Specification:
The chain has 2 domains: about 5-175, Acid Proteases (Cathepsin D, subunit A, domain 1); about 175-330, Acid Proteases (Cathepsin D, subunit A, domain 1), CATH 2.40.70.10. The strands form 3 sheets. Strands 18-17-12-13-22-14-21 form a 7-stranded mixed β-sheet. The chain is mainly β. A hairpin with a 7-residue loop joins β1 and β2 (about 15-25). The chain is built from 4 helices and 24 strands. The protein is about 5% helix and about 45% strand. It has helices at about 115-120, 145-150, 230-235, 305-310; strands at about 5-10, 15-25, 30-35, 40-45, 70-80, 85-95, 100-110, 125, 155-160, 165-170, 185, 195-205, 210-220, 225, 245, 250-255, 260-265, 270-275, 280, 290, 295, 305, 315-320, 325-330. Keywords: Aspartyl protease, Disulfide bond, Hydrolase, Protease, Signal, Zymogen. Its EC number is 3.4.23.22. GO terms for molecular function: aspartic-type endopeptidase activity. Belongs to the peptidase A1 family. It is an enzyme of class 3 (hydrolase).
């Protein structure tokens, strides 16, 4: 089997991407944030504290003839950005782009933190990291991908995120029309439960490529590109007036600037992030200070190849017995 679903930016900045997901019988369609940096599929629901729901579409398990309470199971997750959610668990039928999994754990939120409430466009998350990170207790649950894998034509999914435009998540096949040139594959460590890999270096604009190993995670659920302070300083030094602002929470730059591109290495291959992808717009409405899309990972504890980086590529998440990651230009 295969599946193919369009993923759409939630706003004009590509702050996140939503993908429609069918849950239950008859189908309830919720727009979920596919997140290769976590491993829980959770949804706003009829059980979510009413004051914490503001415009989201909810899953109502009592209206699904295939829903079953997973007795005694609870979940609770905290994300790198400080947001969180928790609740109980149902199993139900879940379909993405025509690919159906029966008996998928659907984690129903009883509580969500303010950032979730305030984002009316995101009805929940669909985790695509390794199932070892799943938070369900006392019996850990599998991700949608893990459940689907054996049925897929090939044990892979691909992320093809758009810049200010829709893109695609495919399951079970590689669309050879969706990228240019060849796909370069690189090793993955699953030791921390992430799609963790080592970039071979970087360049700023038309500058020379610096060969240096940068360990980090391919994370579709993180908006920005978080890299070591040395790398980030080298980038922003090429933008007149750019500076790190403790008050704002990162590098800002004059909105009048033209940003240079940023290249990262995948083996001997190179992925180029155009400068415009690095612009996250005014820090507040009407400001002439703009927020940068490349930020320091110092004090995160891990480098994160988030959407800023991933949307410059066609990315293969290869879930074979020994997982690997593939990147192609597009």
């Amino acid at each position: 089997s295969t599946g193919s679903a369009t993923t759409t930016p939630i706003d004009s900045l590509d702050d996140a991407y939503i993908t429609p997901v069918q849950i239950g019988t008859p189908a309830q369609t919720l727009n979920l944030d596919f997140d290769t940096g976590s491993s829980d599929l959770w949804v706003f629901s009829s059980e979510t504290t009413a004051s914490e729901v503001d415009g989201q579409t909810i899953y109502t398990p009592s209206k699904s003839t295939t829903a079953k309470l997973l007795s005694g199971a609870t979940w609770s997750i905290s994300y790198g950005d400080g947001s969180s959610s928790s609740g109980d668990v149902y199993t139900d039928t879940v379909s993405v782009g025509g690919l159906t999994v029966t008996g998928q754990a659907v984690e129903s939120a009883k509580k969500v933190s303010s950032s979730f409430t305030e984002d009316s466009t995101i009805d929940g998350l669909l985790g695509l990291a390794f199932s070892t990170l799943n938070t369900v207790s006392p019996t850990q649950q599998k991700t949608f991908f893990d459940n689907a894998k054996a049925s897929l034509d090939s044990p892979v999914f691909t992320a093809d995120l758009g810049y200010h435009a829709p893109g695609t998540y495919n399951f079970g096949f590689i669309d050879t029309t969706a990228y240019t040139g060849s796909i370069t594959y690189t090793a993955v460590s699953t030791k921390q439960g992430f799609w963790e890999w080592t970039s071979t270096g970087y360049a700023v604009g038309s500058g020379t490529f610096k060969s240096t190993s940068i360990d980090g995670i391919a994370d579709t659920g993180t908006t920005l590109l978080y890299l070591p302070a040395t790398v980030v300083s080298a980038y922003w030094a090429q933008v007149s007036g750019a500076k790190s602002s403790s008050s704002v929470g990162g590098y800002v730059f004059p909105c009048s600037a033209t940003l240079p591109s940023f290249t990262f290495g995948v083996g001997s291959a190179r992925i180029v992030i155009p400068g415009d992808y690095i612009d996250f717009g005014p820090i507040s409405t009407g400001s002439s200070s703009c927020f940068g899309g490349i930020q320091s990972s110092a004090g995160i504890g891990i480098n994160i190849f988030g959407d800023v980086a991933l949307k410059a590529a066609f990315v293969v998440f290869n879930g074979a017995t020994t997982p690997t990651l593939g990147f192609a230009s597009k």
